[PDB]
């Protein structure tokens, strides 16, 4: 439980730096902009996760069905295995049945 | 976001206040101390 003896340099953060000032800027783009582009397109991320949501099982099964054949051998394997495990666990376990 | 308990130190010390005057190994080691302190209160 021995704890840090010397004060760290206080991290100074300008909340006024570019990215933070400009946060959430185009959020209303569809509405204010006579909808053409959806808020979705403001999402920069992993191919299969854009404008979508799900629990682990759905995520995984999705990554598979989308990028599956572009994955490395080993990751792929671990993915199929995680899938199986999850199948078994969500369907076949719980308190609530 | 891996998060840990920094302050575990005080958590212990707040028990150990009361464990000071005990005889034996009861007055330091947190396990034994806890129990002793319960019986005491």
């Amino acid at each position: 439980f021995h704890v840090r003896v010397t004060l760290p340099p206080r991290k100074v953060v300008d909340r006024w730096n570019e990215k933070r000032a400009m946060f959430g800027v185009y959020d209303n783009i569809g509405i204010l902009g006579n909808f053409e582009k959806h808020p979705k397109e403001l999402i920069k991320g992993p191919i299969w996760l854009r404008g979508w949501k799900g629990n682990e099982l759905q995520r995984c099964i999705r990554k598979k069905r989308m990028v599956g054949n572009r994955m490395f051998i080993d990751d792929l394997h671990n993915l199929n295995k995680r899938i199986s495990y999850l199948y078994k666990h969500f369907n076949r376990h719980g308190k609530y049945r | 976001l891996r998060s840990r308990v920094t302050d575990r130190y005080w958590r212990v010390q707040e028990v150990l206040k009361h464990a000071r005057h005990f005889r034996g190994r009861k007055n330091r080691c947190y396990r034994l101390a806890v129990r002793a302190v319960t019986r005491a209160f």
């Binding site: 840090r4 003896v5 004060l7 760290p8 | 920094t6 302050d7 130190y9």
Partner: peptide
């Protein structure tokens, strides 16, 4: 390296408390 300032700082108060027990000031 993202730590508790809470940890360090709160510890400092102990550190000085003991500084006050081992040398009591005039």
């Amino acid at each position: 390296a993202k730590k508790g300032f809470r940890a360090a700082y709160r510890f400092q108060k102990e550190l000085e408390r003991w500084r006050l027990l081992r040398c009591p000031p005039p």
